[PDB]
Nucleic acid binder design. Sequence first.
DNA 1: TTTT
DNA 2: TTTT
DNA 3: TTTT
DNA 4: TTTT
Lengths: 109, 328, 109, 55
Amino acid sequence: DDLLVSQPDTGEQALEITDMLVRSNAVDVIIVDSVAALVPKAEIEGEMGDAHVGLQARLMSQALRKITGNIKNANCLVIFINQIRMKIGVMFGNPETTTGGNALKFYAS
Amino acid sequence: GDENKKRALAAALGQIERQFGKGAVMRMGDHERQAIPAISTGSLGLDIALGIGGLPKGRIVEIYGPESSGKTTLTLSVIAEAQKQGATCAFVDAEHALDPDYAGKLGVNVDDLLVSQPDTGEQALEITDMLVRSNAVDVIIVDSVAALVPKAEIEGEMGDAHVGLQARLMSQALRKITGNIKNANCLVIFINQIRMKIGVMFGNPETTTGGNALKFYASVRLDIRRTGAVKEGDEVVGSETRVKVVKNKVSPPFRQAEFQILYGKGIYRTGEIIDLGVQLGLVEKSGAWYSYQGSKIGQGKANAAKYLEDNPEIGSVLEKTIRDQLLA
Amino acid sequence: PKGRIVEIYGPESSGKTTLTLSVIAEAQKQGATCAFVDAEHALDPDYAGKLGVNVDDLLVSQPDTGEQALEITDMLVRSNAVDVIIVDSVAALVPKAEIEGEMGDAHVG
Amino acid sequence: VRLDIRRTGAVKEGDEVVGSETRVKVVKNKVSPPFRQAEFQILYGKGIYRTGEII
DNA sequence: TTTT
DNA sequence: TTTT
DNA sequence: TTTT
DNA sequence: TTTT
Ligand SMILES: Nc1ncnc2c1ncn2[C@@H]1O[C@H](COP(=O)(O)OP(=O)(O)OP(O)(O)=S)[C@@H](O)[C@H]1O
Ligand SMILES: Nc1ncnc2c1ncn2[C@@H]1O[C@H](COP(=O)(O)OP(=O)(O)OP(O)(O)=S)[C@@H](O)[C@H]1O
């Protein structure tokens, strides 16, 4: 009961509401699940199988860029959830590889 | 003839001196320094790679590499050396991530330091410009350039197409600030992440962020790559750091150096000095058994490091000859 | 060719900067009076000296503003005493109007 | 007259790198036909690798 | 009179 | 004036 | 600015 | 972003 739910149909709306609430500074812990499940609206408007490779990364990087200062301001708790995708030519090093771009781990403390 | 040309040249130079002052002509003896003033990084491998034994003053330097490569804490060694020099330094971070306890473990005096938490990138730029011109600050550190965002994108919604905007403004910023940076001989570093761009299968797949003119203005660029880590027994205690010179104007490039980075303590100076001493012939080693001056100092890096830390004078004498025989 | 504008462009760090120095060395060989101005304010006199050019017989410039770079270039060219004139990093040149303006202000064109 | 400069490759002697191969292509001229691109090596410190091109 |  |  |  |  003492919890606010969200059912964001599009990832962009999830980002806008997260930004609005973090700045509200009223919320104290912020939880987003299944980052990989987030989809840019450009891919939604596109058909099935269209090549929109390397699109979610730029927008999520922009989102963290915008939100990190406010997150520091409010001392809020933000977690992220990623699945595992084994990428091509990964036989050297760790075969597992995270999703959701690359700058996420750079920003994540 | 020649006297007429000399007289005309002297007249023109005198007019320039009258209008602008001493800045027309370099001082024929004072403008000539045998050695360029610089700031050592605390690792002689990096310094000898730099070819001047320290980071050049008044010149932009940039570092890029894969995420979580210890570049952030790499800057802290430079901060500690600047504090050792007593130079006034300040730190600004765009990602707004900093652990003052972590830095204090690195030995840098966090108190003698100015922090910054710039909510917008434009304010980070304005404060950097204001401080550089103050000329009071001596080393300037900006982290996570990619994390910097134009205010236009902030005012815009999520997913709006503002492509090719940060580059123009950062180019303008460097354009404005480079002259002052030369004026104050201050130390400015930049931090970039790596983004693999489209259609890059030829050449190097990796590509830096933050536009393109950055590398043009930066007088020296270093690549940092995480190759391995050192594990003592079961637990992991430090990460092996590989840094390769990728651009320089004062030294030959591609002078890559190897060194270990130990958490908390910082740079594993004893290991690198031991390695270069034994490889150069200063430190004799009968095969795998480490020794010095015919004395069984110990076997293994830890024993020699312990033997060396208790006597800083011996280490200072050992390092003094290395730079002289290599740098100069 | 003499008395004619010549321009060089290319990707960053392509040795164009040191490419100019060979021209400087040849001009010095001719005994022609030459001067160098750099907008990016990056120059390694040790590096150039390694290139064989006599740095002593050379006039340096460190123009804080682009307008002053232009005024000094105009003054020297008309002096007619100088014979080869080198300006580096034209893009690094900035109008004083943009200097007086804040960060991110629209001074396009 | 306008010249384009492009970094194609670099010369490596043994392990270390010592110079960069420089490709310059003529892109505009009024006294000579354009597109007379030339190949030459640039060696750090020493400068232009004149012997190689003349050979 | 472009600009990334 | 790129960008993933 | 990757992606399976 | 695996695949038999
Ligand atoms: N407080 C700390 N305690 C223990 N180890 C630390 C601490 N801070 C950093 N490290 C270690 O130091 C190494 C690099 O971390 P830092 O230099 O502090 O940050 P950074 O990774 O360089 O910054 P990035 O890469 O841009 S996220 C890693 O091996 C970390 O585990
Ligand atoms: N002092 C130096 N020591 C060693 N190599 C140098 C030195 N200065 C320049 N180089 C090399 O010369 C080549 C081109 O560098 P420079 O001509 O000096 O500068 P530049 O790169 O032309 O100027 P830019 O491209 O506008 S940053 C590169 O291969 C550099 O590694």
